[PDB]
Design a protein around this ligand. Structure first.
Ligand SMILES: *[C@](O)(C(=O)NCc1ccccc1)[C@H](C[C@@H]1CCNC1=O)NC(=O)[C@@H]1[C@@H]2[C@H](CN1C(=O)[C@@H](NC(=O)NC(C)(C)C)C(C)(C)C)C2(C)C
Ligand SMILES: *[C@](O)(C(=O)NCc1ccccc1)[C@H](C[C@@H]1CCNC1=O)NC(=O)[C@@H]1[C@@H]2[C@H](CN1C(=O)[C@@H](NC(=O)NC(C)(C)C)C(C)(C)C)C2(C)C
Lengths: 300, 300
């Protein structure tokens, strides 16, 4: 039993973390096969096209540990630089590039100067920021999920917002959210609480013997969503309810019943009590998260 | 900026996770060099000596993925079984066996059937339990810290306590805490809050722009420790204060001043406000944790 924020094993990803240096900028790059993906502002209100047409191959330094990789070509796909080198990465896994929806989670392998520093779990917030742990030097660390043997790369860090959250891109270059890799006024946008995730975590709670929050009451998804509005919670769809099925099945608590509990928590608070060792309703646990952790799915 | 519970990169440890099967028991083993460390109750109020004198080499199945390892010898060092095999692990890192003190943290690579499932961060509580995330099949997963290039293995899981926390051993076999690998009445013992860690996390808070908890007041380590008693907090030693130095230095907040803040939080609570996104005073962050994360120390 027990329930922790759990990263995926970071090992298949460490094998791909290289250093990318160009001029006075050093950040992290992701070497997959013979291509090194890094954030394009390594070439730095700029005009990266003009700034790239503009460099030569030999301007790009690529350390892979103690091995210097020669770039034999480069392109720019949206906000990522794709530096083609002359060595395929022997440690290249089975991998996907995917793009996540807000609500969903992934593992971040914070790197600096190409060396892995740590791994933790994040969520794509509603406002498309991620509450991360990024310092100067971190740019080019990747978010990712592991599926059997497949790494789904879904994030590259680029930048931090004045509120201390972070913004970045899928590995095909495209910013999650309205942000841009230009140092100009950009505001996160009001965040909301991922309701489907909070229920999943309440299910994680029941599965682990935590029952202090339950009640006999039920509610209809409509009038629950009236109170999820006021508490600035994501409306719950029936599609969220379907997903919650397995968890509702395991525990014999109807998804709607759990909503009536979450309702009452929002209307009263937790009153000195914790759930799964938090005094907050936690929302960076997808339902799939709970099932993985409350059933121990592995990866070879 | 930002601040997360951050595991070490789990890659050097994944390389060592093998499956160990004996009779009707399958758990996880740690293959380092030509020796496979696993929990001794894989041979199962027993008498493991009688139970071991007792098996032969060929009784022990050792999968390393799709490669079956032959045991050529076995011994029992305290509560761990050391199965000598005929193949040294090509992926063996620089590593230590160490034993941690209560208060300190490490990364746990939850494995099942030899395959890594996830990685999260733990603390050795005061009562020498760890609040983990362990299911049937998990036994033999290891806790560990990474130091430059060196893995300090400090934990192997053996068992869960009726309260849902976990107990285990250093890799030399010895139970942290009064627990024993016998299914008999064993109680955790009252837990306490790791005060030195809570301050470190408050320092992590200041470093990240969180100041809502500070005040002009100071206190003497003596009369602080009077209130740390009542709130069931570890007494703070001057030695803890010395450790907090660097963090107190970075922020210009005297360790004692921070204690006066922690005092006031305990005497009032957080009053609807969070620190570093928690409504609880967090204590599984050592000072070294904060400095690593608030300065980005890596590992090659
Ligand atoms: C990232 O590039 C990095 O880690 N690089 C290290 C580096 C070495 C040598 C030369 C240059 C960079 C860096 C990561 C940031 C910094 C700390 N944590 C982070 O998330 N990104 C970065 O500096 C981006 C990059 C510039 C400005 N920038 C920022 O994140 C800005 N933030 C903003 O300006 N955001 C606004 C536009 C206000 C919304 C700060 C935080 C550095 C000021 C790009 C192109 C946006
Ligand atoms: C651990 O052995 C494991 O993961 N093995 C899987 C396995 C496969 C095939 C055959 C046997 C085991 C297992 C891990 C536990 C179970 C779920 N989470 C865990 O932490 N340990 C385990 O079962 C130990 C082992 C027996 C009893 N035991 C327990 O943890 C007990 N707990 C206690 O009995 N603890 C007391 C003594 C009450 C304080 C339970 C939880 C299974 C009942 C050993 C030798 C103690």
């Amino acid at each position: 039993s027990g329930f922790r924020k759990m990263a995926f094993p970071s090992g298949k990803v460490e094998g791909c973390m290289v250093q990318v240096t160009c001029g006075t900028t050093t950040l992290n790059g992701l070497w997959l096969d013979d291509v090194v993906y890094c954030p394009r502002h390594v070439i730095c209100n700029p005009n990266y096209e003009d700034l790239l047409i503009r460099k030569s191959n030999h301007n790009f330094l690529v350390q892979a540990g103690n091995v210097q990789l020669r770039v034999i070509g480069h392109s720019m796909q949206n906000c990522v630089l794709k530096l083609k080198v002359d060595t395929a990465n022997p440690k290249t896994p089975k991998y996907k590039f995917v793009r996540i929806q807000p609500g969903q989670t992934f593992s971040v392998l914070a790197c600096y100067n190409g060396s892995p520093s740590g791994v933790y779990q994040c969520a794509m917030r509603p406002n498309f920021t991620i509450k991360g742990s990024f310092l100067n030097g971190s740019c080019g660390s990747v978010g990712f999920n592991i599926d059997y043997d497949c790494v789904s790369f879904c994030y590259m860090h680029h930048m931090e917002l004045p509120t201390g959250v972070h913004a970045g891109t899928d590995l095909a270059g495209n910013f999650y959210g309205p942000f841009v890799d230009r140092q100009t006024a950009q505001a996160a946008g009001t965040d909301t609480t991922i309701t489907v995730n909070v229920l999943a975590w309440l299910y994680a709670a029941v599965i682990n013997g935590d029952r202090w929050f339950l009640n006999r009451f039920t509610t209809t998804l409509n009038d629950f969503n009236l109170v999820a509005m006021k508490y600035n919670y994501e409306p719950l769809t029936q599609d969220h309810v379907d997903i919650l099925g397995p968890l509702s099945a395991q525990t014999g608590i109807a998804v709607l019943d759990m909503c009536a509990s979450l309702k009452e928590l929002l209307q009263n608070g937790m009153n000195g009590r914790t759930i799964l060792g938090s005094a907050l309703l936690e929302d960076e646990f997808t339902p799939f998260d709970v099932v993985r952790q409350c059933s121990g799915v592995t990866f070879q």
